[PDB]
Design an enzyme around this catalytic site. Structure first.
Site, short mmCIF file in Angstrom:
data_model
loop_
_atom_site.label_atom_id
_atom_site.label_comp_id
_atom_site.label_asym_id
_atom_site.label_seq_id
_atom_site.Cartn_x
_atom_site.Cartn_y
_atom_site.Cartn_z
N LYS A 13 1.01 -1.56 -0.13
CA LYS A 13 -0.18 -0.05 0.08
C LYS A 13 0.80 1.50 -0.05
O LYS A 13 0.42 1.75 -1.45
CB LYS A 13 -0.94 0.26 1.13
CG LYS A 13 -1.45 -0.95 2.06
CD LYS A 13 -2.97 -1.24 2.89
CE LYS A 13 -2.37 -1.18 4.08
NZ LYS A 13 -1.55 -2.38 4.41
N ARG A 88 -9.32 1.20 10.02
CA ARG A 88 -8.27 -0.62 10.07
C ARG A 88 -9.23 -1.34 10.70
O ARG A 88 -9.16 -2.47 10.89
CB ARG A 88 -7.05 0.05 11.13
CG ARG A 88 -6.01 -0.99 10.52
CD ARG A 88 -5.41 -0.95 9.21
NE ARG A 88 -3.46 -1.42 9.95
CZ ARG A 88 -2.99 -0.90 9.77
NH1 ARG A 88 -2.65 0.61 9.51
NH2 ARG A 88 -1.95 -1.12 9.94
N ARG A 123 12.33 -5.08 4.29
CA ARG A 123 11.92 -3.23 4.26
C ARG A 123 13.15 -2.61 4.75
O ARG A 123 13.14 -2.52 6.28
CB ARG A 123 10.51 -3.38 5.13
CG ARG A 123 10.09 -1.92 5.42
CD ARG A 123 8.39 -1.77 4.66
NE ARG A 123 7.83 -2.68 6.00
CZ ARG A 123 7.13 -2.64 6.12
NH1 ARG A 123 5.66 -1.98 5.85
NH2 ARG A 123 6.03 -2.55 7.68
N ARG A 156 12.07 -0.61 10.74
CA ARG A 156 11.15 -0.49 11.67
C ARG A 156 11.31 -1.16 13.67
O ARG A 156 11.54 -2.49 13.20
CB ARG A 156 9.23 -0.55 10.59
CG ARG A 156 9.31 1.08 10.59
CD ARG A 156 8.16 0.41 9.95
NE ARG A 156 7.21 0.08 9.98
CZ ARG A 156 5.52 -0.36 9.84
NH1 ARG A 156 5.26 0.39 8.71
NH2 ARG A 156 5.00 -1.22 10.46
N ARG A 167 0.57 -8.94 13.81
CA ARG A 167 0.39 -8.61 12.92
C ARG A 167 -1.05 -8.59 11.76
O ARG A 167 -2.45 -7.91 11.62
CB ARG A 167 0.96 -6.86 12.02
CG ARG A 167 1.69 -6.56 13.34
CD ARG A 167 2.05 -5.17 12.43
NE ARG A 167 3.09 -4.90 11.57
CZ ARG A 167 4.31 -4.76 11.73
NH1 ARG A 167 4.57 -4.86 12.36
NH2 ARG A 167 4.95 -5.33 10.41
N1 LIG Z 1 4.22 -5.33 -5.81
C1 LIG Z 1 6.18 -5.28 -5.05
N2 LIG Z 1 6.33 -6.62 -4.99
C2 LIG Z 1 7.70 -7.10 -4.05
N3 LIG Z 1 8.24 -6.27 -3.12
C3 LIG Z 1 7.08 -5.11 -2.85
C4 LIG Z 1 5.56 -4.89 -4.06
N4 LIG Z 1 5.23 -3.22 -2.76
C5 LIG Z 1 6.20 -3.13 -1.98
N5 LIG Z 1 7.47 -4.21 -1.82
C6 LIG Z 1 8.06 -4.04 -0.67
O1 LIG Z 1 7.71 -4.73 0.45
C7 LIG Z 1 7.60 -4.53 1.93
C8 LIG Z 1 6.16 -3.60 1.92
O2 LIG Z 1 5.66 -3.29 1.14
P1 LIG Z 1 4.73 -1.63 1.79
O3 LIG Z 1 4.23 -0.57 0.49
O4 LIG Z 1 5.54 -0.97 3.43
O5 LIG Z 1 3.10 -2.42 1.86
P2 LIG Z 1 1.78 -1.43 3.05
O6 LIG Z 1 0.56 -2.56 2.46
O7 LIG Z 1 2.05 -0.26 3.22
O8 LIG Z 1 2.52 -2.27 4.52
P3 LIG Z 1 2.33 -1.91 5.92
O9 LIG Z 1 3.09 0.09 6.00
O10 LIG Z 1 1.22 -1.93 6.33
O11 LIG Z 1 2.45 -2.96 7.15
P4 LIG Z 1 1.87 -2.33 8.47
O12 LIG Z 1 0.38 -3.77 8.97
O13 LIG Z 1 2.56 -2.24 9.50
O14 LIG Z 1 1.05 -1.09 8.42
P5 LIG Z 1 1.42 0.34 9.06
O15 LIG Z 1 2.52 0.84 9.55
O16 LIG Z 1 -0.28 0.99 8.96
O17 LIG Z 1 0.80 -0.58 10.73
C9 LIG Z 1 1.77 -0.70 11.58
C10 LIG Z 1 1.19 0.33 13.24
O18 LIG Z 1 0.41 0.82 13.28
C11 LIG Z 1 -0.08 0.80 14.34
N6 LIG Z 1 -1.88 1.77 13.56
C12 LIG Z 1 -1.53 2.70 12.27
N7 LIG Z 1 -3.34 2.21 10.99
C13 LIG Z 1 -4.23 2.51 12.63
C14 LIG Z 1 -5.29 2.38 11.88
N8 LIG Z 1 -6.46 2.77 11.43
N9 LIG Z 1 -5.27 1.98 13.76
C15 LIG Z 1 -5.18 1.23 14.89
N10 LIG Z 1 -3.80 0.88 14.63
C16 LIG Z 1 -2.84 1.45 14.33
C17 LIG Z 1 -0.85 -0.51 14.84
O19 LIG Z 1 -0.07 0.08 15.56
C18 LIG Z 1 -0.37 -1.22 13.60
O20 LIG Z 1 0.60 -2.53 13.50
C19 LIG Z 1 8.68 -2.37 1.73
O21 LIG Z 1 10.21 -3.14 1.78
C20 LIG Z 1 8.27 -2.54 0.00
O22 LIG Z 1 9.59 -1.98 -0.29
#
Ligand SMILES: Nc1ncnc2c1ncn2[C@@H]1O[C@H](COP(=O)(O)OP(=O)(O)OP(=O)(O)OP(=O)(O)OP(=O)(O)OC[C@H]2O[C@@H](n3cnc4c(N)ncnc43)[C@H](O)[C@@H]2O)[C@@H](O)[C@H]1O
Length: 214
Positions: A13, A88, A123, A156, A167
């Site tokens: 994403k 979320r 990542r 991270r 997660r």
């Molecule tokens: N097509 C492809 N092919 C191969 N490789 C690829 C590719 N596309 C990308 N890649 C690579 O692969 C890896 C992933 O790509 P990437 O683009 O980083 O994918 P992503 O879907 O953005 O991953 P997330 O950031 O969502 O992981 P996350 O569940 O921790 O989310 P968040 O930070 O919001 O949340 C983390 C913590 O924050 C909190 N939090 C955040 N938002 C909320 C909310 N709305 N409500 C409650 N808690 C929340 C919670 O505690 C949560 O656990 C990277 O190295 C990238 O380069």
């Protein structure tokens, strides 16, 4: 225009958010970035997330809704924005609806559970800008450095295997139902819904999204 990105941890994403932003000129609203920033600076609105994120659990709907509200009120969101990692949960989606925040596109990034852990260990991030990289799949132009600022990339605190596994559980428990929720929204004519195959190379996913978004 207003877009929601949906999908499992690591689905891609944030990577594509950057393209949609730098292409259609709307700001990226990333709850993950916002929460990490609040923890880093000790901001009263969001520092509470520190331990929760470390345990791989979701932060309270209450907290994240406040953060997005505050962000979405800014001049730069008047003509649209990209919600990345929000909503979320169903209550987060419901709050948006109560607050009159409809969206034009909900984009689902599908990746099998089995690719997630492996993918995330590669990542690396630039926390000031929220830019993300992968050492094999999307490397920085210079090894270990952010493309834009030249600062040393980090890993991270929550990207460890055990935490990613937690997660993924939370995702299926709390977040996966938004697929049904927003599909129903599309069936009601309230938004457009589109699923992309997030296993393709980054460039191909970018190409698919362009087709969808015009
Ligand atoms: N097509 C492809 N092919 C191969 N490789 C690829 C590719 N596309 C990308 N890649 C690579 O692969 C890896 C992933 O790509 P990437 O683009 O980083 O994918 P992503 O879907 O953005 O991953 P997330 O950031 O969502 O992981 P996350 O569940 O921790 O989310 P968040 O930070 O919001 O949340 C983390 C913590 O924050 C909190 N939090 C955040 N938002 C909320 C909310 N709305 N409500 C409650 N808690 C929340 C919670 O505690 C949560 O656990 C990277 O190295 C990238 O380069």
């Amino acid at each position: 225009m207003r877009i929601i990105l949906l999908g499992a941890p690591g689905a891609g994403k944030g990577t594509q958010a950057q393209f949609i932003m730098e292409k259609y000129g709307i700001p990226q609203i990333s709850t993950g970035d916002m929460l990490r920033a609040a923890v880093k600076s000790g901001s009263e609105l969001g520092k509470q997330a520190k331990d929760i994120m470390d345990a791989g659990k979701l932060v309270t709907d209450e907290l994240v809704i406040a953060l997005v509200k505050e962000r979405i009120a800014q001049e730069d969101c008047r003509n649209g924005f990209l919600l990345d990692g929000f909503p979320r949960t169903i209550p987060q989606a419901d709050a948006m609806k109560e607050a009159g925040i409809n969206v034009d596109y909900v984009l689902e990034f599908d990746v099998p559970d089995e690719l997630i852990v492996d993918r995330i260990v590669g990542r690396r991030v630039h926390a000031p800008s929220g830019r993300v990289y992968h050492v094999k799949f999307n490397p920085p132009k210079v090894e270990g450095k952010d493309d834009g600022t030249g600062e040393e990339l980090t890993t991270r605190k929550d990207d460890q295997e055990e935490t990613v596994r937690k997660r993924l559980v939370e995702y299926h428990q709390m977040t996966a139902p938004l697929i049904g929720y927003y599909s129903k929204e599309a069936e009601a004519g309230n938004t457009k819904y589109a699923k992309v195959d997030g296993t393709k190379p980054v460039a191909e996913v970018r190409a698919d999204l362009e087709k969808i978004l015009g």
